[PDB]
Design an enzyme around this catalytic site. Sequence first.
Site, short mmCIF file in Angstrom:
data_model
loop_
_atom_site.label_atom_id
_atom_site.label_comp_id
_atom_site.label_asym_id
_atom_site.label_seq_id
_atom_site.Cartn_x
_atom_site.Cartn_y
_atom_site.Cartn_z
CG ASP A 121 -1.99 0.86 1.27
OD1 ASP A 121 -2.09 1.70 0.27
OD2 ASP A 121 -2.91 0.65 2.07
CB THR A 159 -6.52 1.63 -0.84
OG1 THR A 159 -5.70 2.75 -0.30
CG2 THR A 159 -6.21 0.36 -0.73
CG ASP A 261 -1.55 4.29 2.46
OD1 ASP A 261 -1.96 5.07 1.65
OD2 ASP A 261 -2.39 4.19 3.66
CG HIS A 265 -2.17 8.66 5.08
ND1 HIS A 265 -2.85 9.51 4.29
CD2 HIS A 265 -2.50 7.32 4.67
CE1 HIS A 265 -3.54 8.95 3.31
NE2 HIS A 265 -3.50 7.59 3.57
CG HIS A 309 -2.16 4.83 -3.95
ND1 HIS A 309 -1.54 5.15 -2.97
CD2 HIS A 309 -3.27 3.99 -3.51
CE1 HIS A 309 -1.90 4.68 -1.74
NE2 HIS A 309 -3.27 4.07 -2.31
CG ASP A 683 -17.96 8.90 -25.31
OD1 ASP A 683 -18.99 8.20 -25.34
OD2 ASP A 683 -17.16 8.56 -24.42
CG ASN A 685 -23.06 6.88 -24.53
OD1 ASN A 685 -21.89 7.03 -24.93
ND2 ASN A 685 -23.66 5.59 -24.66
CG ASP A 687 -20.12 4.25 -23.91
OD1 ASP A 687 -19.45 5.28 -24.62
OD2 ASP A 687 -20.88 3.65 -24.39
CG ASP A 691 -21.54 8.55 -28.69
OD1 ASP A 691 -21.31 7.68 -27.91
OD2 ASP A 691 -22.06 9.67 -28.65
#
EC number: 3.1.4.39
Length: 805
Positions: A121, A159, A261, A265, A309, A683, A685, A687, A691
């Site tokens: 992490d 995460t 991680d 922090h 990450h 595009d 919509n 997605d 289209d």
Amino acid sequence: WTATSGSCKGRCFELQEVGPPDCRCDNLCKSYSSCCHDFDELCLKTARGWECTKDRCGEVRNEENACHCSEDCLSRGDCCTNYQVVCKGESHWVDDDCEEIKVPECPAGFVRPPLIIFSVDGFRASYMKKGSKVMPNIEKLRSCGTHAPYMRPVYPTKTFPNLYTLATGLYPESHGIVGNSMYDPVFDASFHLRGREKFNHRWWGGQPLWITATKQGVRAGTFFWSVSIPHERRILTILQWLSLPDNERPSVYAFYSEQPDFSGHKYGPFGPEMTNPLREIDKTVGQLMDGLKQLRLHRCVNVIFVGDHGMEDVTCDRTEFLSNYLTNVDDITLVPGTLGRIRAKSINNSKYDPKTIIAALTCKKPDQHFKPYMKQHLPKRLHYANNRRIEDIHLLVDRRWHVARKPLDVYKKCFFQGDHGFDNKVNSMQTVFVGYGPTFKYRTKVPPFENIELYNVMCDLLGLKPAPNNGTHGSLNHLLRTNTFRPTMPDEVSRPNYPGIMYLQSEFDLGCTCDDKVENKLEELNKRLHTKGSTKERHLLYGRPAVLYRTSYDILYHTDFESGYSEIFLMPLWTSYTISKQAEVSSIPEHLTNCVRPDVRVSPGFSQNCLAYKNDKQMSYGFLFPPYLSSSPEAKYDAFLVTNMVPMYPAFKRVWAYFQRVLVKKYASERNGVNVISGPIFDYNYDGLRDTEDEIKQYVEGSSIPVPTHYYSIITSCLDFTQPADKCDGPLSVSSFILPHRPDNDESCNSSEDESKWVEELMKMHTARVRDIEHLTGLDFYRKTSRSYSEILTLKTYLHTYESE
Ligand SMILES: *[C@@H]1O[C@H](CO)[C@@H](O[C@@H]2O[C@H](CO)[C@@H](O[C@@H]3O[C@H](CO[C@H]4O[C@H](CO)[C@@H](O)[C@H](O[C@H]5O[C@H](CO)[C@@H](O)[C@H](O)[C@@H]5O[C@H]5O[C@H](CO)[C@@H](O)[C@H](O)[C@@H]5O)[C@@H]4O)[C@@H](O)[C@H](O[C@H]4O[C@H](CO)[C@@H](O)[C@H](O)[C@@H]4O[C@H]4O[C@H](CO)[C@@H](O)[C@H](O)[C@@H]4O)[C@@H]3O)[C@H](O)[C@H]2NC(C)=O)[C@H](O)[C@H]1NC(C)=O
Ligand SMILES: Cc1nnn(Cc2cc(C(F)(F)F)ccc2CCC(=O)N2CCC(Sc3ncc(S(N)(=O)=O)cc3F)CC2)n1
Ligand SMILES: [Ca+2]
Ligand SMILES: [Ca+2]
Ligand code: NA
Ligand code: NA
Ligand SMILES: [Zn+2]
């Protein structure tokens, strides 16, 4: 209800979960407060610690011990990971010279090399160099195995979204875990880090690796670990499972660490307190590797060391507050932090207008450390829109900063000095990849790649067929010694027409004028052969793209460019042209300023007209092949053809013109010529996929001319820039973008300034992979090269990120 009266006598870390109200003994039982009464006693033994010592060597088996130094331990498969080092004079795996693993050297009864995924992490990419002196085991893995300088996570760089993207190959918009925190309007349910609702399976779309394994008859250890189970116990368990009988032993395993991680922090990514966490992770890797070596599995198992990450410096003083922009701040809910998601507090409030809220967050302070966005205007590379759990309003927050609703939230909830969740192109969010084992390559650097591609590789590694996913299979074949997937090019669906001259000027009533009534035999032979494709070798370097859906289109040849012109959409799907290093920029002359000419190869009924653009006060027009770069005054006429024309908002024209007039020539200088394929994208919509006609929400007023939502360009050249684009013998170099086609430039706060102060910056934000452009267009590029398909696939997934080293 759990009748915890049952026992874990001989069921410790059982792979099959049993159904309530029977008690549980699996590695998830703690989290659901469901373990049997004796679980701690039998399954979480700690007596005497985690390492054999000289005096323990050959001891009498004391079952109470956490791990064993007795003689029978190897056969039971429950020794401490250093047993042979201390009690038999063997070396630690890290102290051994590393040796190429040409083939799996496994015990008899193993039907395939097992896979161990060691996930960490917040393990920022730069820790591999910067922490190398304290991480010798990880550093052995990295240098002897296959590694990339970094691995790009998905947005948001949190995460849960990333671990589940690693498991499925899916973008968060598709798998559904779109943040650490979420609300689903259809369910009327929320999802949080804390609590139980995250254990319901309706949140979790796609098919994760362990289900793909199980369904195809490959057994999987359980990927999840309860947070109280110490790291040493997790390793010992994996090693225990690996000792199991051939018919019960899993082929795929996961270890997870909450570090670095957790510490990052508190202390920031490079706080001096971070050295100790990195030491302990490395010690855990050594424990694993020493265990594998005891069991003669160290040259058999493939180990993935992967992060979800990275980590950035973020403190409380760097928090923008919506209360310094919005007066109405109580009528909204904000998902806060390193990204912002805004919706209404109550759907019974009709007076909630998201438009007025966006405007109130737009370029209000001169150094504003976030930008608001309708989710569909977010850069297409983030693929963060097509899910009902993603709020319509989004705030992309600057690296290093936080967004909150009110100041009370920051001081009623300075604690943290690090965080993540920002844009996935930001260096501090980048993470790690190492592959080590028989199926991975030896001492090989590979280029940076996106974590969405691993699912396919982990399936390859296990002889599984991947579920459908957003990886591009074969784009990472260069990580593997063998086991590679051998992909084919998609078959072209629609073949082009090759129209010649079929229409007379007078049949066109476009309402378009051009000042072109200007009049030899040899020069007329010369222009025909340009209209039959004599310079097509020049402008179409990589083959024509293939159209992978059913449609009706025409290839149109010209001296300077070649288009695939759609009769359905009344414009090109693509336009291809090559600008050499030596080429010259000229202006649009005064006589041709508002010249649009009929294309005699294409019917009036399949052409645009100028009248519609006149009648549309909002919409103007531009050109895909830029007149500015015509090879001759005679050839320039071709650029004003009605079939080179596309709808453009005047605000977008500023962008497009600067790109066409300045940047294209710049790139050709810097790169030794460039091939450019440009085109429209639809595009509506959001997605991320081409289209169909019936999904188009906006046409140019009083016509069937559809309005693009975006404009793309793919800019290709030779990776060896000493060779010109048109004469490249080796690998290619590419960068691309998908510009949103927007009626204002509200996105660019400095847009009243000259285009040299903001346009190139906007294009960088909207950088894209060719593969992004493919999903959105139904086209397939790079069809005819001297290069291997795998190499082309890697190239199609490349993203030019515009970050420093
Ligand atoms: C990234 O890769 C992924 C995976 O390959 C790509 O997503 C796929 O894209 C396909 C095309 O959009 C899509 O195909 C559709 O399948 C529908 C059946 O879907 C269910 O089955 C699959 C398979 O098991 C399952 O995975 C789905 O799970 C989704 O939904 C649930 C929530 O309900 C979640 O658990 C999960 O997270 C996932 O959500 C995501 O996808 C859905 C879309 O399925 C989105 O809505 C979510 O926002 C979220 O992103 C499902 O359980 C099927 O019903 C569709 O059929 C309609 O369209 C066809 C076109 O051929 C048409 O001919 C039919 O008439 C049919 O229409 C009917 O319904 C319409 C609406 O109700 C209506 O208009 C019509 O009149 C008809 O009644 C379609 O075939 C596929 O499901 C997804 N898969 C996934 C996992 O997302 C993605 O495209 C890739 N992205 C990029 C950029 O490349
Ligand atoms: C999130 C996520 N997605 N995939 N993983 C597993 C995963 C994938 C990969 C990988 F190989 F993919 F890299 C590597 C490692 C892991 C393990 C992560 C782990 O042990 N964690 C502690 C528990 C918490 S939350 C929790 N939430 C839901 C369930 S459920 N309903 O799905 O059973 C159960 C839970 F305990 C998550 C983080 N975690
Ligand atoms: Ca994380
Ligand atoms: Ca679409
Ligand atoms: Na107009
Ligand atoms: Na602006
Ligand atoms: Zn975190």
